[PDB]
Amino acid sequence: STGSATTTPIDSLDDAYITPVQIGTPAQTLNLDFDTGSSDLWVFSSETTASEVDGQTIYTPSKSTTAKLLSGATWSISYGDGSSSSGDVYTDTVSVGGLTVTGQAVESAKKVSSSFTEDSTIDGLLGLAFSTLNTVSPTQQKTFFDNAKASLDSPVFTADLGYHAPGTYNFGFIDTTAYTGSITYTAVSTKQGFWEWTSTGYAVGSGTFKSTSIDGIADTGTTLLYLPATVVSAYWAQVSGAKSSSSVGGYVFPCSATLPSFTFGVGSARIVIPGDYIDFGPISTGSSSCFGGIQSSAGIGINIFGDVALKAAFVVFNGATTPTLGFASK
């Protein structure tokens, strides 16, 4: 089997991407944030505290003939941005882009933090990291990808995120028309439960490439590119007037600037992030100070190749017995 679904930016900045997902019988379609940095499929639901729901589409298990309470199971998750959610668990039929999993754990939110409430466009998350991170207790549950894997033509999914445009998540096949050149594959460590890999270096604009190992995670659920303070300082030093602002919470730059590109290494290959991808616009409405798309990972504890990086590439998440990551230009 295979699946193919379009993923669409939630706003004009590409702050996140939503992908329609069919849950239950008859289908209830929710728009979920596919997140390769976590491993819980959770939804706004009929059980979510009413005051914490503001415009989201909810899953109502009582209206699904295939829903079953997973008795005794609870979940609770906290994300790197400080947001959180928790609740109980149902199993139900879940389909993405024509690919169907029966008996998928659908984690129903009883509580969500304010950031989720305030984002009316995201009806929940669909985790695509390794199932070892799943938070369901006392019986840990499998991700949608893990459940689908044996049925897939090939044990892979791909992320093809657009810049200010829709893109595609494919399951079970590599679309050879979706990228240019060849795909370069690189080793993955699953020790922390992430799609963790080591970039071979970077360049700023037309500058020379610096060969250096940068361990990080491929995370579709993180908006920006978070790299070591040395790397980030070298980037922003090439932008007149750019500075790190403690008040704002990172690097800002004059909105009048033209940003240089940023290149990252994948083995001997190179992925170029155009300068425009690094512009996240005014810090507040009408401001002439703009927020940077490359930020320091210092104090996160991990480097994160988020959407800013991933959307410059066609990315293969290879879930074979020895997982790997592939990157191609597009």
UniProtKB/Swiss-Prot annotation:
Which keywords, in A-to-Z order, does the entry hold?
Aspartyl protease, Disulfide bond, Hydrolase, Protease, Signal, Zymogen
Reaction catalysed by this chain? Hydrolysis of proteins with specificity similar to that of pepsin A, prefers hydrophobic residues at P1 and P1', but does not cleave 14-Ala-|-Leu-15 in the B chain of insulin or Z-Glu-Tyr. Clots milk
Q: Which residues act catalytically here?
A: D35, S199
Residue ranges of the Peptidase A1 domain? Answer: 17-328
One Gene Ontology molecular-function label: aspartic-type endopeptidase activity
Instruction: Report the EC number(s), separated by commas if there are several.
Output: 3.4.23.22
Source organism, top-level taxon: Eukaryota
Quote the protein name from its UniProt record. Endothiapepsin
| Protein species of origin | Cryphonectria parasitica
Query: Span of the full-length protein shown?
Result: 90 to 419 of 419
